[PDB]
Amino acid sequence: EMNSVMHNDLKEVLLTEEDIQNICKELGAQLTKDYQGKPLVCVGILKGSAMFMSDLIKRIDTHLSIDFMDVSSYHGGTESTGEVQIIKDLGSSIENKDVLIIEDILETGTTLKSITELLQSRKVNSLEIVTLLDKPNRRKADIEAKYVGKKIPDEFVVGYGLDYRELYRNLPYIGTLKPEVYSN
User: Fold this and answer.
1) SS3 (DSSP) at 175
2) What dotted CATH number matches 1-184?
């Protein structure tokens, strides 16, 4: 049931629902092996990462707890400064935990690198990133993910947590927007 007019706002589909499920299976197996019997805490940065987190955690077959952060980056221009406001911190301690940050997309890396530095400072046993999407040529900060679902060119993408003006996060697939939708 795919009748909504929203679907016609897409220039192309980069990942189908089935592709994304398959990505979760593959990453889940690897994370199971890596985190078997470890005190794993999966951390989602709100809002969009929650959808991928949900699907991914299902395929991690070892004990884990979950937690969430809500942050707001400062900008100079429309580029992030690295200064990041904590709207909601983690609700539990991560000292001596194995932390896995779960991300929908890795781009400039600037916000993520601050998050990462705050969490390292809390004496975690380890810290890694899983990201569904990676735009490797947009990287500004010195950061890369250990686990990556799909590398993509620098297109404007929506779906499966990724929004344009708060919409489209509910699509079960990921695709590119028509330039007519976001142009001026």
Assistant:
1) strand
2) 3.40.50.2020
Q: Return the ∠ at Cα 88 (arms to 167 and 156), rounded to 5°.
A: 30
Helices (H), 6-153: 17-35, 49-57, 110-120
Annotated active-site residue 107? The verdict is: yes
Experimental method: X-ray
Q: Which of 107, 117, 144, 155 is catalytic?
A: 107
Evaluate whether 57 touches 67 at the Cβ level (below 8 Å): no
Tokens for 31, please give them: 């994370």
Nearest 5°: CA angle at 90, between 84 and 92? 155
User: Alpha-carbon distance 184 to 96, whole Å?
Assistant: 49
Domain ranges of the chain: 1-184
- Tell me the two tokens of residue 42: 């999966």
List Cα–Cα distances, 52 to 36, 79, 97, in angstroms: 21, 25, 22
Distance (Å, whole) CA 62 – CA 65 = 10
To the nearest 10°, report the CA torsion of 135, 141, 145, 151.
Answer: 10
Q: What is the resolution of this structure in A?
A: 2.5
Token pair 């003006």 is at which residue? 165
Strand partners, 43: 67, 101
